[PDB]
Amino acid sequence: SSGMVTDYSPEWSYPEGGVKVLITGPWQEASNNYSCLFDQISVPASLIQPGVLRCYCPAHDTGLVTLQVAFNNQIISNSVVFEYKSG
Amino acid sequence: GMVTDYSPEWSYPEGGVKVLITGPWQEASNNYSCLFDQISVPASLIQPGVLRCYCPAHDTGLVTLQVAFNNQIISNSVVFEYKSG
Numbered sequence: 130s131s132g133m134v135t136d137y138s139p140e141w142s143y144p145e146g147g148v149k150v151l152i153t154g155p156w157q158e159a160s161n162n163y164s165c166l167f168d169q170i171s172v173p174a175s176l177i178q179p180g181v182l183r184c185y186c187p188a189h190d191t192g193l194v195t196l197q198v199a200f201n202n203q204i205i206s207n208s209v210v211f212e213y214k215s216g
Numbered sequence: 217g218m219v220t221d222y223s224p225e226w227s228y229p230e231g232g233v234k235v236l237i238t239g240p241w242q243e244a245s246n247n248y249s250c251l252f253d254q255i256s257v258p259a260s261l262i263q264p265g266v267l268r269c270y271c272p273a274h275d276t277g278l279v280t281l282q283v284a285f286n287n288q289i290i291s292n293s294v295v296f297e298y299k300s301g
Contacts, residue, residue: 138236149225177238181220
């Protein structure tokens with residue numbers, strides 16, 4: 130299940146967060162221990178189906194941040210840019 | 217089959233927003249498309265079960281979003297919204 134993020138949507142959120150984000154990649158594990166880290170802030174993630182993780186982004190100041198996928202809190206993907214826009 | 221999820225669920229009237237739609241999409245052939253209130257736009261299979269498309273422009277309001285293959289609808293309809301902006 131370790132590898133690289135193939136896509137994610139949306140690529141941004143307003144500062145208050147609370148936006149669903151889908152992240153695709155080689156995630157296959159059955160165990161419910163996936164999480165997503167936005168600028169190191171962790172939120173739980175759910176495996177919708179093989180290769181598809183869903184999470185609701187956390188609140189964060191405007192700016193660009195790293196978005197990573199972890200399993201048992203261990204980073205298992207590359208970092209991709211996620212943007213918090215002032216809006 | 218059925219759409220398992222999709223994101224984002226909305227767009228501004230001008231459209232031009234990337235939308236990922238997940239489900240039982242396995243086909244190898246490059247003939248997937250997405251229908252927004254009957255407006256068709258091409259879609260690409262990023263990887264099994266994952267389709268990417270860029271939504272069309274549309275007047276404010278709720279519309280149906282469906283997945284098709286070879287121009288024939290193969291999924292249920294899910295709500296997609298164009299917000300005033």
